[PDB]
Amino acid sequence: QVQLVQSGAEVKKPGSSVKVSCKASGDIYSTYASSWVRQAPGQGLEWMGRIIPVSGTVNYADNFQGRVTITADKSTSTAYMELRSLTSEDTAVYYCARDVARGGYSGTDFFDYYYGMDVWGQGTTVT
Amino acid sequence: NLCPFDEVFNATRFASVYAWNRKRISNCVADYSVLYNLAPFFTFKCYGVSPTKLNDLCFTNVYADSFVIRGDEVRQIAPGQTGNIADYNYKLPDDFTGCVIAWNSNKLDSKVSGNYNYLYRLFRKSNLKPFERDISTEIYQAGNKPCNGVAGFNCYFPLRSYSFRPTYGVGHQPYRVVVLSFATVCG
Amino acid sequence: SALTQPASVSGSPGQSITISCTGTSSDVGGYNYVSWYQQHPDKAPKLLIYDVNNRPSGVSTRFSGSKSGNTASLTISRLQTDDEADYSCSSYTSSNTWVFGGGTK
Numbered sequence: 022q023v024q025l026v027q028s029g030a031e032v033k034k035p036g037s038s039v040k041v042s043c044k045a046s047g048d049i050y051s052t053y054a055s056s057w058v059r060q061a062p063g064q065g066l067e068w069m070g071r072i073i074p075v076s077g078t079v080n081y082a083d084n085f086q087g088r089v090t091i092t093a094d095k096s097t098s099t100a101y102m103e104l105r106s107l108t109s110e111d112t113a114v115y116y117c118a119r120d121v122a123r124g125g126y127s128g129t130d131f132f133d134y135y136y137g138m139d140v141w142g143q144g145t146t147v148t
Numbered sequence: 149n150l151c152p153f154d155e156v157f158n159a160t161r162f163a164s165v166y167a168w169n170r171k172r173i174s175n176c177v178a179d180y181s182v183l184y185n186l187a188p189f190f191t192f193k194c195y196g197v198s199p200t201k202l203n204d205l206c207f208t209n210v211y212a213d214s215f216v217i218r219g220d221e222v223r224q225i226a227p228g229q230t231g232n233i234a235d236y237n238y239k240l241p242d243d244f245t246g247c248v249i250a251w252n253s254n255k256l257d258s259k260v261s262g263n264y265n266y267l268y269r270l271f272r273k274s275n276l277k278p279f280e281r282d283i284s285t286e287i288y289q290a291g292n293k294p295c296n297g298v299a300g301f302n303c304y305f306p307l308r309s310y311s312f313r314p315t316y317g318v319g320h321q322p323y324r325v326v327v328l329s330f331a332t333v334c335g
Numbered sequence: 336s337a338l339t340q341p342a343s344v345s346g347s348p349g350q351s352i353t354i355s356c357t358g359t360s361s362d363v364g365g366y367n368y369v370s371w372y373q374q375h376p377d378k379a380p381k382l383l384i385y386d387v388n389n390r391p392s393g394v395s396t397r398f399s400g401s402k403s404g405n406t407a408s409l410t411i412s413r414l415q416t417d418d419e420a421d422y423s424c425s426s427y428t429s430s431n432t433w434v435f436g437g438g439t440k
Contacts, residue, residue: 058435066372066380066423066435078190080431084336116379124226127194127247129184132222135427137370139391141379220366220429317361319429 023047023119025055027142034148035107041145043100043117051075051128053119055100056138057091060114071120074098075128104147117142151176151333153183156212157249162324165215165237166269166307167283173210178333179203188251191222191323196245196330203335211246211329213238216257216266218310219319222250225327237269241278246329257322258312266322267307279329338362338424338436346419353410354422354439355403361429364405371400371409374421374438384409 024047033039043055057069071080074093081089085104093100100117118141120134151173163169180202184192197205217225217233224234227244234240240248257263269282271289276282288294291302312322338358345352356363363369367387374380382391384400387407400409409422422439 056433065421065438066374068425068433068435071431076185076189076192082336082432118379121385124193125195126226127192127197127199129189129192129199131190131250132219132431133193134431135223135366135368137382137385137425138372138380139382141381144379219431220427317429319427319431 023049023053023140025117025119025140025142027117028145030146030148032148033107035109035111037107039102039104039107039115039147041102041104041115041117041147043102043142045099045117045119046097049098052122052124052126052130052133053098054122054134055093055117056120056134057089057100057102058116058118058138060116060144061110062113069102069115071134072100073129073131074100076131078129078131112148114144114146116144149175149177151178151210153178153212156214157183157326159214163215164266164268165217165233166267166281168213168215168238168281171212171214173212173333174208175332176210178210178335180335183249189249190252191248191250191325193226193249194247195227197247199247202247206331206334208331208333210333213327213329214325216253216322216324217268219252219317219321219323222248222323222325225250225325232270233268235275236272237276238281239276239278240327244329246327248325248327250323250325252318252321253324254314254318254321256324258314258316260314263312264309266310266312268310269306270308271304271306336434338426338434340424340436340439342437342439344419344422344439348414348416350414351410351412352414353408355406355408356424356436357406358426358434358436360405362434363402363407363424363426365429366427367402368427369400369402369407370425371398372423372425372435374423376421380421380423 025045028042054073056071059067070091072091072093090103118138121136122133184199224231340356371384372380424436425433428434
């Protein structure tokens, strides 16, 4: 319903820097917020961060504080992801999804994203 | 003319949530251009309006509730929600039309050992109607055994303190919530 | 971080299974917000439960979750023959984060 379109994969052997852009232009309200997850090959997910593009307020998991910089512009309302100081163990898939705000109101709520993640991107298998 | 918002937002010490000091704003002009994308405004839930067009909506009155709650208790400061912050402590109307603003205040409220000057109404057997408080405390809550005194185990003391600590979360950190409520106040 | 959850599942159709996600008393148990996801092999996941028990619209009847005070749990009844996937959890995690615990396959 929101039509997330994500970037292409990269073969960045370590020491490089990766940007992954999450283009979504469907039902883009002021309550839209795009989280970010990792998926390593063979094991489970790891939630990375979250952006609210109408404000720019940024969450992180503490395993990715100072490693990831989630940039997003307000007019296009789409999010980027700068993972830096890579490792060969960081070969994974990096989805972006859509955290669902639970309420009808105006923009800029940092807290309402506790429903889940309904729609997702398509995965950029960054190596 | 100008509003005293920075006397409300940039104040020294806020109210507690059980005794939320309502502050009335009128006979004034309300500039909201410094108030929507100012840096520490994590929460800006507006309900009856839109905050871009808040600068051209003249209202006859502005209320400004203000208190200090947890991070994960801003979910009750919203119409139609149930907890023990909207139910027992501070009820927001279903016909709400103002804005709910909040920001982290770990430096100003929580201290290194623990700061216990903030209290909330855990026990009350009547739900609060919108836009009023109970400030008075008495140990007699209707569990059972109506005997009165300084004791417990059936009837408990109502007010209890938040346990605020800096290395204890950001959803458990003091969020200095300021709730606005809404033709002499223009923009 | 890393709510432990067993990655063991029997692919025998016609029975009922149950997967219990544990966690500390600020991840699951501190909240009633445990959600569940299933994932295709090498595709994106999709949402099943959001609060404890609920479901969004495009979700079958058997997809039900539950809590136990500290150990959240999803169950499957009438295990359809080709529905096995990678079941993953989440929770509001006392700091606005989510925490996904492993998988099951």
